[PDB]
Amino acid sequence: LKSLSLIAAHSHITGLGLDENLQPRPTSEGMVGQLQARRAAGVILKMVQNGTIAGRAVLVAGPPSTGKTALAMGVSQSLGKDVPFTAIAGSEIFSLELSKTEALTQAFRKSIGIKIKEETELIEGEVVEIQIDRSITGGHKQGKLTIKTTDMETIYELGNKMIDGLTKEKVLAGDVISIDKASGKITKLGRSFAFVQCPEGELQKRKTVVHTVSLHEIDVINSRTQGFLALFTGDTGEIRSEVRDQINTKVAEWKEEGKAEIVPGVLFIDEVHMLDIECFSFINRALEDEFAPIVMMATNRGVSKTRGTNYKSPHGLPLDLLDRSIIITTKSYNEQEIKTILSIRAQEEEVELSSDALDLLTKTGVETSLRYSSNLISVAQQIAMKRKNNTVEVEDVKRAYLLFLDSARSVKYVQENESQYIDDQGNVQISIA
Amino acid sequence: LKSLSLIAAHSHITGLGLDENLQPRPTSEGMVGQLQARRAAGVILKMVQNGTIAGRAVLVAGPPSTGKTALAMGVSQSLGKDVPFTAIAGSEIFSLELSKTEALTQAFRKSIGIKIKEETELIEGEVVEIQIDRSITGGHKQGKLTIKTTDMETIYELGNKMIDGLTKEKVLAGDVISIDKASGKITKLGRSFARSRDYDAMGADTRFVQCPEGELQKRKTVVHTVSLHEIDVINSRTQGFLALFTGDTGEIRSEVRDQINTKVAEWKEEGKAEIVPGVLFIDEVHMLDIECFSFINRALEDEFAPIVMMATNRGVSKTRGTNYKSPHGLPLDLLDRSIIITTKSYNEQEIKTILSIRAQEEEVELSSDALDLLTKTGVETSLRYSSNLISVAQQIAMKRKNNTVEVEDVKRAYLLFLDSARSVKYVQENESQYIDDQGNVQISIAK
Amino acid sequence: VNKLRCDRRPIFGKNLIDLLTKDRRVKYDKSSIIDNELIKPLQTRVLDN
Amino acid sequence: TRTAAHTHIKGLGLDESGVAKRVEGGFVGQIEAREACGVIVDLIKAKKMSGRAILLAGGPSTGKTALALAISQELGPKVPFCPLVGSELYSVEVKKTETLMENFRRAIGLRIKETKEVYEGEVTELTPEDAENPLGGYGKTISHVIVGLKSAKGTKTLRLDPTIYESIQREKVSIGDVIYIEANTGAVKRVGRSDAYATEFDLETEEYVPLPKGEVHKKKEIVQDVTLHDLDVANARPQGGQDVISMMGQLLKPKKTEITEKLRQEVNKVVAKYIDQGVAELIPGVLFIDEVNMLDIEIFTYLNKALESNIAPVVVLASNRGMTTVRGTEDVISPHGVPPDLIDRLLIVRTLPYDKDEIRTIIERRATVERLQVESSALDLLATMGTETSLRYALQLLAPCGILAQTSNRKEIVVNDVNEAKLLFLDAKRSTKILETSANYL
Amino acid sequence: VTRTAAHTHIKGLGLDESGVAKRVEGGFVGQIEAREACGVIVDLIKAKKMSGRAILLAGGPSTGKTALALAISQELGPKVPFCPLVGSELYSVEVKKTETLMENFRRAIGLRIKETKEVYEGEVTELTPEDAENPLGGYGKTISHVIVGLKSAKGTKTLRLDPTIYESIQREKVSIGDVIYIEANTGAVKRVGRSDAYATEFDLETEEYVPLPKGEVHKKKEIVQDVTLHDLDVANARPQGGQDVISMMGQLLKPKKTEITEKLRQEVNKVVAKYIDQGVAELIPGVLFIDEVNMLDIEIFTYLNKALESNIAPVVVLASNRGMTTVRGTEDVISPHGVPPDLIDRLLIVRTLPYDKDEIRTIIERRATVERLQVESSALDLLATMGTETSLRYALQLLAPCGILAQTSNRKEIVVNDVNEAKLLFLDAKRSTKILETSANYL
Ligand SMILES: Nc1ncnc2c1ncn2[C@@H]1O[C@H](COP(=O)(O)OP(=O)(O)O)[C@@H](O)[C@H]1O
Ligand SMILES: Nc1ncnc2c1ncn2[C@@H]1O[C@H](COP(=O)(O)OP(=O)(O)O)[C@@H](O)[C@H]1O
Ligand SMILES: Nc1ncnc2c1ncn2[C@@H]1O[C@H](COP(=O)(O)OP(=O)(O)O)[C@@H](O)[C@H]1O
Ligand SMILES: Nc1ncnc2c1ncn2[C@@H]1O[C@H](COP(=O)(O)OP(=O)(O)O)[C@@H](O)[C@H]1O
Ligand SMILES: [Mg+2]
Ligand SMILES: [Mg+2]
Ligand SMILES: [Mg+2]
């Protein structure tokens, strides 16, 4: 129910928080401001929830300290369970054991999943007693027991393999167990009278079981007999393309038969400004396949040089990828919006702030970067904890301000002391006299 | 003497020429001159023999052929056996199998040693008769075996589990075996001498040893010297001892190293194992990657850091991996934590002693006038040069069959083999004949 | 046979078998723990899947 | 007693809820720096925030690393602290990204505590108890098994369910042998024979342990801590002696493999399951990267997305350099070598050079740990030399002056000894000045 | 019949006992200085006292450097190990170049091993087990000894064996009438095959047949085989022993080079250092030869400095052509011959002179005599002028095709018209560049 969780930057935001009309609310579901951005992201949200379209790319641009990464986080949160969501960094695709193109395809394979359902019978009931028949050095053994439930009291003989299972996990008359016929697995809900009541209903019931497996897993399983170990060990390379071409046909047949349904996922890539050109040239073609997960990116870089080429392309990506991709920009934050973000960060971290400390923190947060002002709010509580009261006061924020330096403040301090710091040329003065 | 007897660059240097007052002798212990540098090395020598300090670096500086390599080599000889020493090169730590960081970590690990002592209680003696009853009554009837030693003989009762253990590694008696006291392990040393005449051709397992002398069971302690690196390689693999000889380490994870450090800490607390501080010497460090420099800067501050000494003859020059030129060829951070020892070029008076002391090593008798020409050519050339001419002139004089090397043979030896300065001139005049950087060469002599 | 025995016998272990088991065996006890349920080795996952 | 450039640092040296003392824990000066780090110690002890990084910048020999060792001391031995260098990220086995992600998960530890009741002692005797079976039968029926236990200072008799006969048969214990019995889990364990039985046989291969001390019934608790990475390695690595996959483990070589995200999340699931029941306790640790200037821009990029992770711990950075070109990009210029986007996510802690009066106290405090004592006259030279040449030079000259003092048999350093040590060992500036006057290529 | 590639006409240096070089000897013409210079090298190699000494011979292209480097190897003899090496071969994908350099360094030196073995061989007449009626308490069932008779042409003998070496025979599935090989030292039994006289027993047979071994029964022999130290290291790294299923797959896997630790090398030097003290073994030095040393990286050049200072370092000879050029792996460094000056300081420099035209005319003559062909003198002069106008190695290449045109013209001797015809079909580099400069697409 709860994965290991600590206070994080993207913690507070849950869901995209859009109206049924798709218009954004001023403050909803942890997100504040950025109207056109959240709406344009919601169009993509209902676009994925439709699932009738494939092979589309979209880009989220902007300067630093935007929330485009937060926006995509809100799209992944509003996406909900049962929809696979894969987020990889741009520098992750580079690998020594695997090719960059092969790993790039491996990223496309993980995003789209497949659901398969099946029905398995189940017997759940209390035990009256157990009777086993064995012989010392005599081989064959014979078990018998008696299962009891409110409306049904019956007696079942024990098979050869049922004996080993009942001996593996201790079964008693007091203990209530539930066993599947086909699986043969023994499941103990707990202990009855020496705290669960006898199960209601019939002794034998049939319930459906659903299994969900990503395309990448099916791809790795069929490569080698030990290829199943490559799932957990993560060691696999140069998967045969013929295996993928066969898997696509088998999955298509599974869709036509109605046996297995596919769930389209979302692929998210962070820091796409640095990527090799072979990766882009492979993406251009790879987005046109029948199963292509919806791709959303993030680029905070302006006009710069693409890695692998000497020339400088606009936005940091070649124009071939900019063509088929859609560009969703972002804008800076108002002075009041920063105050709202800092306030909801205080609510997420559960830290009470004074009004004057909120105004001062908003001013020094507008002058400097926003993420820095969000960084001080966590230390303010620790500094105020020594004062033995729980509050954030302007004095404590000033002390935290002189203790921790802003980047722009450190730029000057480096520039005056440059003789003390190590120059790019290598010269440094370590002596005061 | 245990090492191979083939002569090396410097075979004459043994130990250092410092007294108990550390004042160097002008010619002693195989070396010559370099008084201040030798004393500065002896301070490091007592610094290692003390063992109370750790994590320090020292540098040896000088031009080529100044004695920097014969200096650190003299330190390893005076240091003696049982004190672990590691001499590598900066270019050797570049490997495709290991990363430079881990390859340098192993270079720091091999230098520091560990001495482990262990005591054993064993019962060793020759067997006379072994009786085991089976069908008389049954069920481990308590057979008895008689063990014989030269000065003592006793009879031992055998338990049921010992009855089962004696069946494996079957013993007919007439044999010398040893049984561990703690674990009851049975070990077969080999047959006695009376069994040698039974067969004309015998297997490869058989052998003959004398009957053990003295008491039947004894208490003996054994001492072992194992470096931390060997411990880490052994603990890293199921079988790591084969990985030692095959040379494939596998880039041991740094997680195991902390566990090994705790193990050594507990062994030192119990007093079973004491550590010997080692020495690490890296030759020609002027070529090294910057990542290795930073990792040396950090790795020198740990609890076990072997004393590091290095020699670099480069002046102010560009470091490998960066565009800028740092002085000495090393970053200023590595020079900040270090101590620099400078060596000065030899004079004429010292060179002739370095020559004759070399002829004593090559066992080549020289005339009084041969050292004059060899020294005169030794001043213009480098000291490391004429030392080869002292070797060739011995063969040229051997063709003339007469005793010591005559001066004329030295002149012929100098005439046949060109100096490094002359080849530059012969190349500069003949440039059209030799290949050029641009690739242009004139093969044909006809114009 | 004298030279045969003079050759065969001096076989010296470069380190030891007792040094291999001396630097391996752990002083710490077994300490039976629930960590056995926190491991689930790769071989068992083939059976559970 | 080994001392390398350290060990005179004991903790941060703070006081209770106040400004740091002038001199404590071998620290002199820089009260603001170790105070600001003092707040970071509280932030780490809070065990709440995640992926929060800080960077202390300053010139060389300003005490950058000693602060990280100090906070490492302040956290305690139980809190995991991983020393790491930026040069270690490059490995031939796996990509740098996987090594960085692995070191990121090496920081957080997990503690497990377990209380189990035990029954240990010798065996006085074993007798069955016959009772009537529920359904009539001719053969024997045993209701319970009686087991006596003898230990030092006490004795006890127990009654067990008849199902214990299978475990006792498995352990093959009969009489006069010390056993191991766990209360609720049950069965048995045979540690070894009792000590008084060694005399009955002159030669035996079974060891005899003494009777257990104290009561026969005991309750003890054992706490075991394991990091999440060490937990993941055991999950990914196969374990068996004779297994065919394990058979391929031998004769081949193990190499570090990139661990999938699915496995990490799967371990997080069971760790969360045990932390919900109260049996597990998750303590975040601290990662420390020295010389961050040596990191490529590809790692700096992965730190941006990595620090925003939920389980990401607190990582402290140190960069001595000033404005430099980031590795991997020739045109880009950023302070300290850290890209501005990454600088935006952290807090900078400045460091200042030490005063002359602080330097003299540094050397005089180093003398105590060095165990060497110096006069007042020779110390004043070490101060001026330390300020002119460099700080680490006067600290490096301490041992040679003591060895020369032992050659002169004097127990304390003298001005003549520090001058003689000055002539033998040269600092950087003198050597660089000698290189210019020599045409020998020196 | 016989193959000749730019070589095989040099049988050695051809030096007199006084060290003076003849005008022409052993397929070598001129170059008295360089010949006398290498003879002293051969003497130093025979002296065995010096180790790690190195001598560099550098000259222009086609000056006879390499041809002389083969002549010294011919002068040393087959017993002295000689390992040819090229700088471009030191780079390997499996292991770092350094381990390959140090590896060849140990491949140069070599060691001789002598050991005596005694073997009983012959046809098995009658073999019987002998069981002891005494139980002894140690075993349930065993044998005291096994007697196996052996038949040979010179005589027959009966042997008394232990049950283990008989168990080996039972593993070999030996039956009466089959020749066996039993060695006393290792105690190994090998079945050669069934005796030849028994072949007529069956019409069709799978087993091979061999004659009965000569010799009485027992034989005493020693083996003087010489083996390099590096071969002891490789045999030390990969064990051939054991029946384990792991060892089988270990034999199946391809050999992969690995970096050998210094400890193992030190142990091998210890056991060899003991065997040379017992007199059972004798160590001999050997010569390492590297061609195109200029192709080496500055890393290998630096490691050569530490490698030459080792005691086991063999004599190595270097040969380079180019003048002062930028050393590979260095940016602004310029050094003569493409070798760093610190290494040049260690070596000894020998210079190689070019060849006069009158010497070239004799070179073509000797190459023709070894080529066995027939050349007219009038065409010999033209071939000499041709060789002097273009290159020395071009006329030696011109001797080959003319022999074919002479056969098509049926003439036994080469004629001026034949070589004049051969010049038009085959061009040298100078003409190829001239025609290369003016053309449409890259000539
Ligand atoms: N609309 C928003 N609602 C809440 N938080 C926001 C919003 N926009 C930005 N943020 C804050 O910005 C911080 C990180 O900004 P981010 O988008 O990661 O910068 P970059 O675009 O450089 O990656 C997050 O901690 C988040 O709290
Ligand atoms: N103390 C000494 N006494 C005699 N000869 C020496 C001494 N030191 C060095 N040499 C000579 O110097 C040569 C080695 O110089 P080396 O230390 O290798 O210079 P570098 O290390 O600069 O290359 C040897 O041939 C040796 O004869
Ligand atoms: N407060 C202090 N008191 C005494 N010595 C100090 C103090 N701070 C630093 N040092 C000295 O500085 C050295 C560590 O310097 P370090 O921080 O590694 O330099 P850099 O900043 O270049 O990393 C230690 O050996 C220690 O003796
Ligand atoms: N002095 C000589 N006598 C006879 N043949 C020679 C002589 N010098 C060179 N050659 C011939 O020249 C050919 C090529 O010369 P080579 O030694 O390969 O030149 P390089 O040393 O530049 O490689 C060889 O096949 C050799 O037969
Ligand atoms: Mg971002
Ligand atoms: Mg050297
Ligand atoms: Mg530091």
Question: Where residue B198 sits, what CATH number does that domain have?
Answer: 2.40.50.360
H-type alpha helices, B20-178: 35-50, 69-79, 100-109, 160-167
Residue A253 backbone phi and psi in degrees, to 5:
-65, -40
- Tell me which long-range contacts E263-270 makes (C-beta under 8 A, separation of at least 24): E263/B244, E263/B245, E264/B244, E264/B245, E264/B247, E264/E233, E264/E236, E264/E237, E265/E106, E265/E233, E267/C14, E268/E229, E268/E232, E268/E233, E268/E236, E269/B3, E269/B4, E269/E229, E269/E312, E270/B2
For A358, the token pair is: 């909120």
Other chains touching D, judged by 3 or more CB pairs under 8 Å: A, B, C, E
At B226, is the secondary structure helix, strand, or coil?
A: strand
Q: Which residues of C touch D114 (CB under 8 A)?
A: 33-34
For C8, the token pair is: 């065969």
Do residues E13 and E28 lie in contact, with contact meaning Cβ atoms separated by under 8 Å?
A: yes
Distance CA B92, CA B292 (A): 12
- The DSSP secondary structure of B250-290, one letter per residue, reads ----HHHHHHHHHHHHHHHHHTSEEEE--EEEEE-TTS--H
Counting CB pairs under 8 A, whether chains E and D reach 3 or more, is: yes
Q: Which residue, B304, B300, B278, is CA-closest to B86? A: B278
The closest ligand to the CA of B31 turns out to be 2
Task: Check E267 against C4: CB less than 8 A apart.
Answer: no
For D163, the token pair is: 């199902």
Distance CA A314, CA E128 (A): 94
Task: Check A425 against B324: CB less than 8 A apart.
Answer: yes
Distance CA E351, CA E59 (A): 5
- The DSSP secondary structure of D96-111, one letter per residue, reads HHHHHHHHHHSS-EEE
Q: To what resolution in angstroms was this structure determined?
A: 3.6
Q: Which residue, C46, D352, B36, C20, is CA-closest to A227? A: C46
Q: In Å, what is the CA distance from B410 to each residue of B99, B373, B392, B416, E386?
A: 50, 8, 8, 10, 43
E strand segments, E73-114: 82-86, 110-113
Distance CA B217, CA D347 (A): 70
CA A383 to chain CA centroid, Å, is: 34
Q: Which residues contact E206 (CB under 8 A, 6 or more apart)?
A: none
Q: Which residue, B94, B256, B101, B293, is CA-closest to D89? A: B101
Task: Check B207 against C8: CB less than 8 A apart.
Answer: yes
Rounded (10°) angle between helices A394-403 and D31-46: 110
Distance CA A283, CA B337 (A): 51
CA E92 to chain CA centroid, Å, is: 20
Q: Which residues contact B417 (CB under 8 A, 6 or more apart)?
A: B388, B389, B392, E37, E55, E348, E349, E350
Would you tell me how many other CB atoms lie within 10 Å of the CB of residue D230? 16
Interface test with chain C among B233, B234, B235, by most C beta carbons within 10 Å: B234
Interface test with chain B among E302, E317, E350, by most B beta carbons within 10 Å: E302
Q: Which amino acid is at D273?
A: K
Q: Which residue, A278, A324, A330, A314, is CA-closest to A72? A: A330
Would you tell me how many other CB atoms lie within 10 Å of the CB of residue E170? 12
Would you tell me how many other CB atoms lie within 10 Å of the CB of residue A308? 11
Residues at the binding site of D are 58-65
CA B425 to chain CA centroid, Å, is: 42
Task: Check A426 against B336: CB less than 8 A apart.
Answer: no
H-type alpha helices, A90-195: 100-111, 160-168
Cα separation of the two ends of chain D: 39
Would you tell me how many other CB atoms lie within 10 Å of the CB of residue D233? 15
Cα separation of the two ends of chain B: 62
Q: Are strands E54-59 and E349-352 parallel, antiparallel or unpaired?
A: parallel
Instruction: List the CATH number of the domain containing B372.
Output: 1.10.8.60
Counting CB pairs under 8 A, whether chains A and E reach 3 or more, is: no
Interface test with chain B among C6, C9, C19, by most B beta carbons within 10 Å: C19
Distance CA D316, CA D347 (A): 10
Q: Which residue, E284, C22, D33, E190, is CA-closest to B272? A: C22
**Any chain B CB within 8 A of the CB of A431?**
no
Strand partners, B176: B126, B190
Q: Are strands B175-180 and B113-130 parallel, antiparallel or unpaired?
A: antiparallel
How far away, in angstroms, is D262 Cα from ligand 2 center? 61
Q: Measured from the CA of A13, which atom of ligand 1 is nearest?
A: 4
H-type alpha helices, D286-337: 297-306
Among chain D residues, CA nearest to E247: D251
Strand partners, A122: A180, A205
Would you tell me how many other CB atoms lie within 10 Å of the CB of residue B432? 12
Distance CA A90, CA A274 (A): 6
Distance CA E161, CA E129 (A): 9
Among chain C residues, CA nearest to D220: C31
Q: Which residue, D324, D274, D276, is CA-closest to D300? A: D324
Q: Are strands E82-86 and E325-326 parallel, antiparallel or unpaired?
A: unpaired
The answer on whether B27 is annotated among ligand-binding residues is no
For C35, the token pair is: 């960590």
Whole domain around residue B400: which residue ranges?
A: 348-430
For D258, the token pair is: 């990139």
**Any chain A CB within 8 A of the CB of C45?**
yes
Distance CA B385, CA B251 (A): 42
Task: Check C42 against A232: CB less than 8 A apart.
Answer: yes
Distance CA B393, CA B371 (A): 12
Q: Are strands E145-151 and E315-320 parallel, antiparallel or unpaired?
A: unpaired
Q: Which residue, A3, A72, A28, A9, is CA-closest to A349? A: A9
**Any chain A CB within 8 A of the CB of D59?**
yes
Q: Using what technique was this structure determined?
A: cryo-EM
Distance CA E92, CA E256 (A): 11
H-type alpha helices, B274-382: 290-299, 332-336, 348-362, 370-380
Q: In Å, what is the CA distance from E35 to each residue of B388, E10, E322?
A: 19, 13, 21
Q: Which residues contact E275 (CB under 8 A, 6 or more apart)?
A: E113, E281
